[model samples]
Target: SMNPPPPETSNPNKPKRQTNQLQYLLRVVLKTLWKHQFAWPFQQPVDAVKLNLPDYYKIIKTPMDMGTIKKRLENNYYWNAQECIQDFNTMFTNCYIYNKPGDDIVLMAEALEKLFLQKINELPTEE
Candidate 1:
């Protein structure tokens, strides 16, 4: 089985709305990915439209796993946080002017990173 994919009739020109949807989807993805391990719930179900990443990587089929993330980093996204942020800043200084799907995706990713970090931070640190 697979998770249902999001609708595809979205107007590509509307980056703002699309960005929001992308962010929401990315959040789910990150959460699912963070909890990804040799266990259940790591995968639920997904549709084909909700497959690949937006210009970042390929569609993550079958929920998510470490191998998938590793492959993404090594193959598609050939950079880490620093590299990603540096490139985003350099390429899209004023997103309002040169706003593109990539910029919004970066924004969502950065925001997701902050939120995910905060979530992990909320967890009790190890002694």
Candidate 2:
């Protein structure tokens, strides 16, 4: 080692980087994708996800924090989770579904990946 000994660094686990809400969000996105989307290269041609897929986890696990989601939706004056999901689905559907060919498919996919990742990065590191 040519450099002299550096001072000892201090660390206390750094809080595990919090694993990120984006990761959870992306996980739900992917699970939804794999379960609902079966668009082959020849079928839909654009691989649009089926937004109305049922939630197995919501059926089985019934995680503890659903009340917050319910409260948020109700406070926002939305009717229900279906309504919220529909609104979210429209964002994606309106963006992609159209008469145009899937010529820009790869480009759009890359841009969405980058854009969502950047949004994740913009989020605070902790909950």
Candidate 3:
């Protein structure tokens, strides 16, 4: 049987003390990207330290399998990381302020392009 549709209350604008599921997922995605060295633009080790997040090695010494990722995603009420990543992609893609995004936005787009878009491209072709 298909799972029931979840509530329509995944708010991202809530306070940090009342962090939403999407916000937690975003942080998980960011940490996963950094730990996997998935084409992260910033210099690592230092980046992790400066960010004040857990040490990448301490957090994840080995890579996570697809099974584990899927289970965790399900438990966290997310179907997959693609949807979250796609939202960021859409935000960056449609950010043409003043006929063009400024340099900061350009840099963000470039960084996300290599990391997320490349992974999106590398997915197996659907039947």
Candidate 4:
């Protein structure tokens, strides 16, 4: 009668440590992207009415941005690093599709994209 009950056991198959590390690295990369000088243009969702691009939403069906990405990251919306990278790719591609070549925004997007690629490449692949 004096013996205590055993503690409840959690899921043993979950690789919690690896998953946490991966999420940390993803967050760091995103923070770097947000700090980049050319990142302002992509910090938030585009205002179609203000920008006078009536076809903006129509052209860019899947809108993505640093703010939204960060929100998704913090909210556990992304199940893996690849999903986060996909969103970044989509954001940059949308910029190219909507803005003309040599435009200031497009130029910024190009620079940010290069920086992002470099940073993510530095992320650990294993261990």
User: Residue 51's C-alpha lDDT in candidate 4?
Assistant: 71
Q: By the lDDT metric, which is better: model 3 or model 4? A: 4
Whole-model lDDT, candidate 4? Answer: 0.73
Candidate ranking (TM-score, best to worst): 4, 3, 1, 2
What's the CA RMSD for each of the models?
Answer: 15.9, 19.2, 15.0, 13.1
Total clashes for model 3: 0
Residue-by-residue lDDT tens digits, candidate 4, 1-127: 1212211122345333335535764567888889888888788777777677788877877787888777666555655677678888999999999889999989899988888888787876654
C-alpha local distance difference test of each model: 0.35, 0.33, 0.40, 0.73
**Cα misplacement distance, residue 87 of candidate 3 (Å):** 1.3
Tell me how many clashing residue pairs each candidate has: 8, 0, 0, 0
TM-scores, all models, native as reference: 0.25, 0.24, 0.33, 0.79
Candidate 2 residue lDDT tens string, 31-67:
3332333312211212222333244223322121222
lDDT of 3 by residue, 84-118 (tens): 45544543443332114556646654665566555
lDDT of 1 by residue, 14-115 (tens): 332223222322344344445534222112222334644242223322133223333333333422233323332332232223336566544643454455
Clashing pairs in 3: none
Candidate 4 regions with alpha-carbon error over 4 angstroms: 1-21
Best by lDDT: 4
| Candidate with better lDDT, 1 vs 3 | 3
